[PDB]
Symmetry: C2
Subunit: 594 residues, 2 copies
């Protein structure tokens, strides 16, 4: 074989240092894959690394997608054409600050123990691998492609110690034809290294850390020595920045310090910068952190304070690493990096608007049942879900309670907003005065704000979204529900010919003309909460709590000539004009460091 | 027919006022059934009412028990012998401040929507009714028995509005040959009346309340008038006292005020006093309240501040009601009630003791699996559950977390206590410094402190006890578990020849001689928490937080001659002697 893991990495019989950067194909529009990969090569780096997101490729059971934004094969080809090698990390679980850590939400309805040696789960992964891996085998280095090696699971030592599970994934990958070296990655301390690895089965071990390479590599070396392994040192995720969460301040890391930290890694071994270019969590694909029982959703932008910013442009950090490489690793040739230009556009007028309630039938097919159903139970993975029932008021004032609902609920009676409850607020008493006679329409709009992507809440009860127990009026649970799943993947079905009323979730259309499409940012600082679309593509979520108050619009999302932005707003904000800016708008929050 | 509901209750063609009192056969030892029923008759009342507890009668699916302490037929016969009528409320769900509201815990292992029109659930109730109802049909008044009528579900308006569910229950009862009038009971306001009833299908409606009979009956009357029903008014649960919960003050109700309130009901209609005699939640059968997401376990004593106290003796409240009856309803003949005498026994010394860990193997059959299992999936309904694993320490200090466990957890490493966590404390960081080398034994003793018995938490995730997600060490879930179910229904398997170690859950035995068995109270003020047995019979739980600091011992639990009391105590707080007192020991609660 051309690439071997011995006492060192060897490529064609010569010692080889891997200089990799992470770029997730699914977080960068395909039109910009070349741009981002070029900038990685230009830095003097020789390898690109990416996760593969199961929940993108098998969004519904048995339905596979490998084209367009998800054309991993094309991404790898672009990398190969640029003379870059590839590391692929096709774990069913990728963590990755990504919805449910990459697991398809439909697994939550199955009789199985997710992320374990449970055969039912392993078999689902197998059926997925049957579609994914044969696309990658021809792209192994030994088959004329560029893939050096692939990862088994992902940071499993930060979740469990089921060795049968790791063995099963390794076995599946091998059976599917993956004949390149395999490896695991984990935190470089004893507990995670012991739990996450198959070192005693000679499966290569790499470490994830964000600083102190000498110390962290020493801990890995001790672990290798203890098991008598003579292996090269590699940091598979060198965390070069920080991700962001709603309501929390943006923290950045000094470019020079980071470049120095990277130098230390390279002085002893190999690296994969996480992230090289972070990009965007388009649509509803953001992940979520947890603290005890509390969920902390992560933001749309995956800028990450990476070497390339969300847009793909070199930052001061890129330049600092470039200078470090030029000095300490001059044997790796560099190129001038590529920049994209951005544009701005003022005073784009509102053209049409419609209340969600007035365009429901166009957007969603209602599911009726006696008892309320959860989101995944209804066959929905992402987005919003409207629960509707009709009820007689049995007293002047009555109490309503949403029992076991997540993540955020807005309650309306006869179209009138009554209450909004987020997370732990859900379940608190709600009081109202309904119709004197006949039935009042009770509407509850629920949002899935992102399933936790790691750790102890990974399989928490709250991971299943929507209303899990029921809605109480007085002391009894209400029955006869119409459910309107609102994945909002069908903006073309928004019927702007219908009515609009203030103080309801609504869609707002803004039309503008573009001569030459360029990168830009939609300013949502004056709106409340919701999502935005440009030319039918879901840009992701906005929320005026910040820290991010914009949504990035890649040039490739725009068209020459007529364009339309649609804003779905849930909090009642109303603006007759929007603006696009050359740079993102930020909310400054106490404790930040820009 | 002998009994019918028209514009009024008619018994053998004559208008009839039902004067009922609640006595639950399963809360009073069978030896004292006559005593309590006699005292009900003595008050001038004519009817006894009782729930039937499904979780007692079908403890394991397909396994039915109707003998001894559970001999409902005998209870009804004794009532008939005393000339009392009976109302039976055989709902699958009884609420009743009783474990899981009477539902068998094994239902939690089934794919079904409990307490709904789900056929899977209805079919389970049907199989239960196939065993229960044929035992009651021959005891219907028309068939020579004493049962006047029976309830369909129980306060369903305080839970749902599934009319198909109510219809199914009614249909099951009819199909089992129950031909007497059926009825529902609910709170006497519009929301609960509408939700919990089948008035439009002519199913009789009763109300539950604890005061303001005129106002509450007026709300029922309006509901009746609205639906064109000319029916008698009955309060099927007139709450005459208060139940108690650990760490909360005992509330009592003035005897005279209560008697006055009862009179108000009787001036307009019929009544069932809840409770007439409350008795005891023996063993692990207590219920649990909820406030928001928080569980509030109810105590062992179901004294309830009822007319008869836990022991079955008339109280000031009994006398006040008796006086009210003699004054305002003199047409009902009364009798002098019966009293039981109690005993005391000082300083009964500790005979022997043994740590739980040292007697595990005789007490429990372990179940081994890679991932930890919950209590019910292991086949256990009540008691304690020991989770055991072996693990080595990967740093001088490591963090442990119990993820999604209920209700109370005690953690030991190599036999040494590390931490106790109750309810919401479960999940908090636990830091430990363990064996420098090799595997340490990690033991986690979990207690099921009582499943919620009503309301929005009735089917909460927390109703399944044990550890639902896992135990984390550092960042990873630990695997390879030995589970020791500890229902503690086998005290005869406690091996006192085994070793005892301080600071561990342990069993303590106290031997004494009894001349003539009499009611008494076991003083547990100086023991931390646990349960107690007398002659192998589980008296229920104790907890030094109070308000109750004793366990009632019915005379029938004692034997002539040699007796043994075994205390299982989990906190490491015990006494080298015990006292049996004439009256219960109580603690004031802030």
């Amino acid at each position: 074989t051309r690439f071997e893991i011995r006492d060192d990495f060897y490529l064609d019989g010569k010692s080889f240092k891997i200089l990799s950067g992470a770029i997730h194909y699914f977080r960068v529009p395909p039109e910009d894959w070349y741009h981002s990969l070029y900038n990685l090569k230009a830095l003097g780096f020789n390898t690109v690394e990416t996760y593969v997101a199961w929940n993108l490729h098998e969004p519904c059971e048995g339905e596979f997608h490998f084209e367009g934004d998800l054309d991993l094969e094309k991404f790898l080809q672009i990398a190969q054409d640029l003379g870059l090698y590839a590391i692929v990390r096709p774990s069913p679980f990728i963590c990755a600050e990504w919805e449910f850590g990459g697991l398809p939400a439909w697994l939550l309805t199955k009789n199985m123990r997710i992320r374990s040696s449970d055969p039912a789960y392993i078999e689902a992964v197998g059926r997925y691998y049957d579609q994914l891996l044969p696309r990658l085998v021809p792209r192994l280095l030994d088959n004329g492609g560029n893939i050096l090696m692939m990862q088994v699971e992902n940071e499993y030592g930060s979740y469990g110690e089921d060795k049968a599970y790791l063995r099963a994934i390794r076995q599946l990958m091998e059976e599917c034809g993956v004949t390149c070296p395999l490896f695991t990655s984990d935190g470089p301390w004893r507990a995670t290294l012991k739990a996450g690895t198959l070192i005693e089965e000679d499966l290569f071990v790499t470490g994830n850390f964000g600083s102190k390479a000498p110390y962290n590599f020493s801990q890995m070396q001790e672990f290798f020595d203890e098991h008598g392994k003579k292996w090269p040192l590699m940091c598979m995720e060198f965390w070069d920045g920080w991700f962001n969460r709603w309501k929390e301040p943006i923290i950045t890391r000094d470019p020079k310090e980071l470049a120095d930290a990277v130098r230390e890694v390279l002085e002893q071994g190999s690296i994969n910068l996480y992230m090289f270019h972070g990009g965007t969590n388009f649509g509803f694909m953001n992940g979520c952190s947890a603290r005890g029982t509390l969920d902390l959703p992560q933001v749309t932008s995956y800028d990450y304070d990476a070497l390339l910013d969300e847009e793909g442009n070199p930052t001061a950090k890129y330049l600092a690493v470039k200078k470090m490489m030029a000095t300490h690793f001059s044997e790796y040739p560099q190129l001038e990096p590529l920049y994209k230009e951005s544009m701005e556009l003022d005073a784009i007028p509102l053209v049409e608007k419609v209340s969600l309630f007035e365009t429901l039938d166009s957007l969603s097919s209602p599911v009726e049942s006696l008892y309320p159903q959860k989101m995944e139970e209804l066959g929905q993975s992402y987005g919003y879900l409207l629960y509707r029932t009709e009820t007689n008021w049995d007293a002047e004032e009555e109490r309503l309670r949403i029992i076991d609902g997540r993540d955020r609920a807005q309650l309306y009676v006869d179209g009138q907003w009554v209450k909004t409850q987020y997370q732990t607020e859900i379940g608190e008493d709600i009081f109202y005065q309904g119709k004197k006679k006949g039935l009042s329409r009770l509407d509850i709009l629920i949002e899935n704000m992102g399933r936790v992507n790691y750790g102890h809440k990974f399989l928490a009860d709250t991971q299943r979204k929507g209303i899990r127990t029921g809605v109480c009026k007085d002391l009894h649970f209400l029955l006869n529900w119409k459910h309107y799943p609102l994945p909002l993947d069908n903006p073309e079905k928004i019927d702007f010919s219908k009515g609009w009323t203030q103080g309801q979730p609504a869609f707002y259309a803004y039309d503008f003309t573009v001569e030459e499409p360029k990168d830009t940012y939609l300013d949502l600082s004056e709106f409340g909460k919701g999502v935005a679309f440009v030319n039918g593509q879901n840009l992701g979520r906005f929320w005026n709590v910040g820290p991010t108050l914009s949504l990035y619009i890649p040039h490739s999302y725009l068209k020459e000539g007529a364009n339309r932005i649609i804003i779905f707003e849930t909090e009642g904000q109303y603006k007759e004009e929007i603006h696009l800016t050359r740079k993102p708008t930020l909310k400054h929050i106490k404790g930040e460091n820009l």
